[PDB]
Ligand binder design. Structure first.
Ligand SMILES: [Zn+2]
Ligand SMILES: [Zn+2]
Ligand SMILES: [Zn+2]
Lengths: 49, 38, 118, 98, 65
């Protein structure tokens, strides 16, 4: 668990955009459930935006 | 450069997506366009 | 309200003391006994008004997903707000919306007949 | 109390505790790890002795068979307990319709 | 009510009766006549009684009572 979800999520997004982390990884933050999910397994469908 | 980002099915539940680059940001022939409420 | 032993960190069963005519919480594992602060034993809440406003955080208003609104806040008169619906999902739950103000993080119901603090 | 805390994070919500009360009531019979492992190993007997080289077998099954993805080592088995608690919390939330 | 036995080494010769009102588990074999009694709980099963009987037999044989 993490106490500052916003800062961690922003840092992860910045790193992914910069290219340090593979863009294929999917990071989802849910405030209502206060849950952070990171997915790297293959077979996941993604599109560019 | 981070200009374009990959989004999966799960992440789409926690983001808002605009229809066109400049339509939602700012002769009754053109199709009615949804107002930019956000 | 349900508590624990506070010593062994275990649940407490209810019992009746006719000599003292009282409801006492005690666990058969240990000798610890206590007197119930309030006469609450069982509750089912077939219809519950709580749990509809859940998950609110300090940065709730910063979420782009929540839809914005320009309603004047009762206290600070801040037009900017984020409005959502009841968190609980049911086929009979009312469609009453809740508005949260970024400036003060105060949740107020959209209803005007009655004012709800949360 | 530790089991309830793992299952339910926010003690304020008494509905979850009320719904789980029968669970703890029926599970109160077991208080020892060895007894729990023996009971788990009771089913699916294959001509073995529960007290002789079966507690280790049940422990290995729990280490591997139960939530293999989270880990495969016995150094830290609390992650399985936390994941099970989260699963039970989600199940209770779905049951309550929230 | 069919389980293996150790004294006579006969399969399915064991029958277990669980009295939840008295919370007593009784295991009896129809061939060698061996009878054993143990304490049981509402969640008890015949496998539990068999395991308890086997443990008691092992303890008696070892002489570490
Ligand atoms: Zn106690
Ligand atoms: Zn305000
Ligand atoms: Zn026999």
């Amino acid at each position: 668990v993490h106490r500052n979800p916003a800062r961690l999520m922003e840092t992860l997004r910045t790193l992914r955009r910069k290219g340090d982390i593979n863009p294929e990884v999917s990071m989802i933050r849910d405030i209502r459930e206060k849950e952070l999910k990171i997915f790297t397994d293959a077979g996941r469908v993604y599109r560019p935006l | 450069e981070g200009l374009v980002e990959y989004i999966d099915a799960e992440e789409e539940e926690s983001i808002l997506i605009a229809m066109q680059p400049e339509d939602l940001e700012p002769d009754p022939a053109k199709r009615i366009r949804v107002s930019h409420h956000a | 309200t349900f508590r624990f032993c506070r010593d062994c960190n275990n649940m407490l069963y209810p019992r009746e003391d006719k000599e003292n005519n009282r409801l006492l919480f005690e666990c058969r594992t240990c000798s610890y006994v206590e007197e119930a602060g309030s006469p609450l034993v069982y509750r089912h809440e077939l219809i519950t008004n709580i749990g509809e406003t859940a998950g609110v955080v300090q940065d709730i208003g910063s979420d782009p997903t929540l839809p914005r609104s320009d309603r004047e806040c009762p206290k600070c008169h801040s037009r900017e707000n984020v409005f959502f619906q009841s968190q609980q999902r049911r086929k009979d739950t009312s469609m009453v919306l809740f508005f949260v103000c970024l400036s003060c993080s105060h949740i107020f119901t959209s209803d005007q007949k009655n004012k709800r603090t949360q | 109390g530790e089991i309830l805390e793992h299952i339910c994070y926010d003690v304020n919500d008494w509905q979850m505790l009320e719904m789980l009360k029968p669970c703890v009531e029926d599970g109160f019979v077991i208080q020892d790890r060895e007894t729990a492992l023996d009971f788990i190993g009771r089913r699916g007997t294959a001509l073995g002795i529960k007290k002789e080289k079966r507690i280790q077998y049940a422990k290995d099954i729990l280490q591997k068979e139960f939530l293999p993805h989270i880990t495969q080592l016995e150094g830290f088995e609390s992650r399985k307990a936390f994941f099970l608690g989260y699963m039970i919390n989600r199940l209770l939330l779905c049951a309550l319709d929230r | 009510t069919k389980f293996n036995c150790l004294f006579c080494n006969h399969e399915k010769s064991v029958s277990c009766t669980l009295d939840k009102k008295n919370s007593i588990g009784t295991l009896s074999c129809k061939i060698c006549g061996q009878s054993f009694q143990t304490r049981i709980n509402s969640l008890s099963q015949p496998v539990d009684v068999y395991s308890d009987w086997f443990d008691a037999v092992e303890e008696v044989n070892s002489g570490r009572g």
